[PDB]
Amino acid sequence: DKICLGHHAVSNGTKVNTLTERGVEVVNATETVERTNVPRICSKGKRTVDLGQCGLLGTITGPPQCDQFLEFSADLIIERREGSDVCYPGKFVNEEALRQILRESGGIDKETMGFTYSGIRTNGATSACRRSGSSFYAEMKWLLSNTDNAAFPQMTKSYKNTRKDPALIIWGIHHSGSTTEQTKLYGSGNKLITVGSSNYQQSFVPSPGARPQVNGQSGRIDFHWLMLNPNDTVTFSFNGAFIAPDRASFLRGKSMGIQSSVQVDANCEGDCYHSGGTIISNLPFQNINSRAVGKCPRYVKQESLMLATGMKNVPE
């Protein structure tokens, strides 16, 4: 006598949202917002460098803890909280910019500046910077007056970049704990340190004075830098208080840099990283961390957004 059309239905459906309604029940749905994190840095198939105790900027100047990272090479660079850029207390001017340059560098290659010296000490050291007793930054030279209180002779040193890529040049200004300590190391008188390029112009003066002891030192070394273009020259003219570069650095290629607190894992591959780990997901969105970097799903505030993959559920 008859025939009847119908559709399927289920006992337990899944609620989604629409333009018109909240909590409409549908046969099946699927999540579009990622909440699952992997608590490791998933580094499978990538040249990784976990800096540990070495601070990124320290790879350029070379304090003891960065001795194994002076010429590294990497697809992925990992900075750690415990990392430190310095042995002798101090700071980099323009520090975050340089970090950004280095994180994306693919690593660094070094070449000597070829600076020689005469009629001065070249070998200054400290207990703040120890390699079997007192030492210094491995890429830098602490230039002193020959003997105590002796005048530091007015020097001029220069370096041309013969390479096809830009060079990274570093130097340091030393600020003694006292004026009398400054005179002891580099003789008395107001010290001027000049630095110039075709692209760049600047000058510096030391500033002896009392500071709180850090690594048992109330003195400070300010580090400065510039990017020297192919076939350009840099000249350093100095009365003293000056920490000269022994080597120049060159960028190897491309990399990605991250900051994290979790372990490396070569069993797991991923391109979206954050300090708590790796977000492995095909989903378009994520509610895990808004500072995730790499190739990530977009960060959104919603914990969940269910996408219907079935019809409306209408049970009896």
Binding site: C4, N282, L283, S290, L307, T309
Partner: protein
């Protein structure tokens, strides 16, 4: 939905139908019988599938750090970065809420639609050989056995064969 079949003139769905999304139940001399429709089921499935393949995507768009969890950047630039990031969070949260609401409205109306298509396709096969119950049911005047039912599903049902007897039975 927009078409008014699902949660519409059909009272409710069938928990018994496990071979597809849409189907037929009949009543005749030999007994009752349920069967899933492959075509209608396939169109809906393939379309919902096509949706997922567009959305289950991720860019090849890389971004790097522009600030620092270990050593805070200068406060002014720090605040501009945060302001911008928060502005982007707002935009993407909106986008995502809308995208999903817009797609779901459409997914539901697509399912409702595929049913309504299947309904009227059958209606036309039958022509004057049956009438419209209103609850999603086609009352047949001529008696129609299980071979006659499978020809309706197959889209091989010949209306002219059973016409004379069914029209007289108006």
């Amino acid at each position: 939905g927009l078409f008014g079949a699902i949660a519409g003139f059909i009272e409710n769905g069938w928990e018994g139908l496990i071979d597809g999304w849409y189907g037929f139940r009949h009543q005749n001399a030999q007994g009752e019988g349920t069967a899933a429709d492959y075509k209608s089921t396939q169109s809906a499935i393939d379309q919902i599938t096509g949706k997922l393949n567009r959305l289950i995507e991720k860019t090849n768009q890389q971004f790097e750090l522009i600030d620092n969890e270990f050593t805070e950047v200068e406060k002014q630039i720090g605040n501009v970065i945060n302001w911008t990031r928060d502005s982007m969070t707002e935009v993407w949260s909106y986008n995502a809420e809308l995208l999903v609401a817009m797609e779901n409205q459409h997914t539901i109306d697509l399912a409702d639609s595929e049913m309504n298509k299947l309904y009227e396709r059958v209606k036309r096969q039958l022509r004057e050989n049956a009438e419209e119950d209103g609850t999603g049911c086609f009352e047949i005047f001529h008696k129609c056995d299980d071979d006659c039912m499978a020809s309706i599903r197959n889209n091989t049902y010949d209306h002219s064969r059973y016409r004379e007897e069914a029209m007289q039975n108006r």
